[PDB]
Structure 1
């Protein structure tokens, strides 16, 4: 199904909408919803916290089982877990947290994980508390992702700046 609506096509494979990813996931129930995760899969605040709260903590208990059995992810890495009631799968992806000294070169490695799935609903990696420049994150996405990605950005002001900079 992947019934995405109201998106603006930026490139052949990148679409963008001013929307809350949790709300989009509920309506669309996409095959894959991306989580802006940390290496230990602790979904305490922001986007990760909101996705986890929408599953009524079922994603946190699953992530905890994953970590105990497989160990933490590396910055730029990912893992595929259940999407619970939000999606068929959740692709947890760790972008660099530049506010904590992590390499911005790893933002390319993080978006590369998207290429293992045909269609994904995702947030802007490394934006918000992670400290990366959001327009730079969208540029890395556009150059790196080759599969079909629907980006939800929950801030009209930021959405407008992104669309203006892209001029598309």
Structure 2
């Protein structure tokens, strides 16, 4: 038993809710919140900009130190950093950004990072400003992630479409 409330169950291990991932994290304080990161960990907009703003820019400060030490992530890769006031940990995961021409097949590799964590609060990778089809992102998620994932979908109209079209 865990503290996520109001989710619709899609599969054995994937759940979904129309919610603001920032507000959900602020209320649940999950062990892991996933950020929709880029390889530079520049949290300017979309989910990343919102999560970072909610940390009062502490996420960005920590991220800049991480990059200065380690260099950029790979598309499809991830790193674990602090969750600040939102979660114990933040898993920064880089899905491919279609608006940069990145190979959509890397989306499966991106979701594989979730399997290293027993339970996660997460957005749909490569959705939103990353330019992928969210219906496809959900199919890859369901077919790749084996751990328990609670997906927060900000847009109500999109949430209803994701549910109504789910096979």
TM-score by length of 2: 0.98
Structure 1 moving runs of 4+ over 6 Å: none
Output the CA distance in 2 between the equivalents of 1:150 and 1:45: 21
Output the CA distance in 2 between the equivalents of 1:99 and 1:46: 13
TM-score by length of 1: 0.98
SS state at 2:74 partner: coil
**CA RMSD, Structure 1 to Structure 2 (Å):** 0.9
Deviation at 1:152, TM superposition (A): 0.1
Contact 1:2 1:31 in 2 (8 A): no
Deviation at 1:46, TM superposition (A): 1.3
Cα deviation, 1:34-81, whole Å, max 9, x if unaligned, reads 000000000011110110011101100000000000110000000000
Contact 1:18 1:156 in 2 (8 A): yes
Output the CA distance in 1 between the equivalents of 2:55 and 2:125: 21
SS state at 2:121 partner: strand
Deviation at 1:3, TM superposition (A): 1.1
Contact 1:16 1:151 in 2 (8 A): yes
Deviation at 1:97, TM superposition (A): 0.5
Between Structure 1 and Structure 2, how many residues are aligned? Answer: 167
Deviation at 1:2, TM superposition (A): 4.6
